[PDB]
């Protein structure tokens, strides 16, 4: 009913390509600039001379207010810095970490993040190489090929294709005589600024089935950890609303994405991704 209502609302404005969606997105962008100017969303830490080299993109810095502060191996002169933010879940908890594609020299920091926050599942929405270009460092282990950074040793335990566009990697990670299972899901064919839809949903369901109970955040990244990252988080958020049955009467995608954007820069990056989101939500409902 809340669902059918949302659906009714979407159809009534011309669906996916309705003019009003552009206006909504334009408005989200406006609120974003406004936040920067008001300093509600700042990038002091990302801008520090010690941290600048840890950003893959010079124009994508984590917001100070929600940034992930690393304290593992702090005791030994490690920096607290990683280009990543927390995003709140439906229940107000820190349900997601949105972060960039690790660089060769941030690989260790990525794993510090995964260990410190007890992450069980990572969703990667990019590829190591896209068109040109290196877009994310391999931070997982390969079959006959541990990966070692600092005190961490990553081992590939198995890997299978969940489906045509999604790889599932089962990893063991070892740090200080301790092992933990970590599952990584990688979507192979999602272009940056763009959109995949069935398999993305299978990715989210799978992630949610591996995660189980437990308060630990999901780790969601792309190349910069904005566009494709935000889409993923938003989809999981809304699916979580849905599963609960807590879709309000006045349910607004504009307000969900707005809240995302508040917590990770460019969480949903393009109008085209914004439309796709509306559409995915429709489907999830129908």
């Amino acid at each position: 009913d809340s669902a059918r209502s949302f659906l009714e609302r979407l159809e009534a404005r011309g669906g996916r390509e309705g003019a009003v969606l552009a206006g909504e997105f334009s408005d989200i962008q406006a609120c974003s600039a406004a936040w920067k100017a008001d300093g509600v969303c700042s990038t002091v830490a990302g801008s520090r001379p010690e941290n600048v080299r840890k950003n893959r993109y010079k124009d994508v810095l984590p917001y100070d207010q929600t940034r992930v502060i690393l304290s593992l191996l702090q005791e030994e002169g490690h920096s607290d810095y990683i280009n990543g933010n927390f995003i709140r879940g439906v229940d107000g908890s820190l349900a997601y970490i949105a972060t960039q594609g690790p660089l060769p020299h941030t690989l260790l920091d990525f794993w510090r993040l995964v260990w410190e926050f007890g992450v069980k599942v990572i969703l990667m929405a990019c590829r190591e190489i896209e068109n040109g270009r290196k877009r994310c460092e391999r931070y997982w282990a390969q079959e006959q090929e541990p990966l070692q950074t600092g005190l961490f040793c990553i081992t590939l335990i198995k890997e299978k294709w969940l489906n045509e566009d999604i790889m599932l990697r089962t990893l063991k990670v070892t740090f200080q005589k301790e092992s933990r299972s970590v599952y990584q899901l990688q979507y192979m064919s999602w272009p940056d600024r763009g959109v995949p839809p069935d398999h993305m949903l299978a990715m989210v369901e799978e992630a949610r089935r591996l995660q189980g109970s437990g308060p630990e955040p999901l780790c969601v990244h792309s190349s910069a950890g904005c566009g494709r990252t935000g889409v993923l988080c938003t989809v999981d958020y809304v699916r979580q609303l849905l599963l609960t049955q807590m879709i309000p009467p006045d349910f607004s995608l504009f307000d969900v994405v707005l809240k995302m954007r508040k917590q990770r820069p460019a969480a949903v990056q393009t109008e085209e991704q914004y439309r796709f989101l509306y559409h995915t939500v429709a489907q999830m409902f129908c």
């Binding site: 893959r56 993109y57 010079k58 124009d59 994508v60 190349s223 910069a224 904005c226 460019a266 990056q269």
Partner: peptide, 5 residues
């Protein structure tokens, strides 16, 4: 490189 442009 910049990611947004």
């Amino acid at each position: 490189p910049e990611y947004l442009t």
